[PDB]
Amino acid sequence: VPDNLKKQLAVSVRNIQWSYGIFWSVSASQPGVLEWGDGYYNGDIKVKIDQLGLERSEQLRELYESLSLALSPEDLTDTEWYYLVCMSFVFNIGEGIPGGALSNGEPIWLCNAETADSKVFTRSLLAKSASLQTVVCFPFLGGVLEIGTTEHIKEDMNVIQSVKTLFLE
C-alpha cells in the first residue's frame, strides 16, 4: 500500500540479511482479508544498473502472473518456489501468521517454521521444501510485514526495529 514499498522492502531485507520480505495488504473490497501486496526476494538463485538487486524479484513476480493465466519455472530454486507460491495466499481474519499478526496487533516470531502446526502457520510444508526455518510477521503501515530466512535466528526485536526504521526513513 505505502509509497516506495518495493524499494523499502529491498533496503530492509538486504540490511538484515534475510531471505525475503513480503508486505501483506488488506483487500480494498474484503475487510480484514490480507493479500500479497509486494515482496523482495533476497535468496539463492542458480552492479551500477540495479544497486538494490530488484531484477530477480521483478522476474519472479512476472513469472507468477504468467503462470496465473524471462524466467521459466524449471529455473527456480526451492526458496524461489516458496517466494512465488506465497503470492497465491489470501488470509481471512485471524488466519495464518499474517492474519494473526493483524488481528492481535503484535509481532509473531515463528521458529521451526518447517514443522509449525497448521493452526499457527499455513505454509509449513512449503517452508520445509525450501528449508525456511524462521518466519516473522508484524503489523505495520496498516498491513503486515513478513520476513523469512533459511537460518535459525533467535528472537531479536532489534531485527523488527531495523526494518521499521528503514521504512520510516
Binding site: 519455472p73 526451492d78 507460491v85 497465491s88 510444508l125 521444501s129
Partner: peptide, 14 residues
C-alpha cells in the same frame, strides 16, 4: 500454477 508438471509440484511437497 504449473498444471501437470509433476516434477515441479513434487519439489514443493516434502
Amino acid at each position: 500454477l504449473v498444471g501437470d508438471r509433476w516434477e515441479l509440484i513434487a519439489g514443493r511437497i516434502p
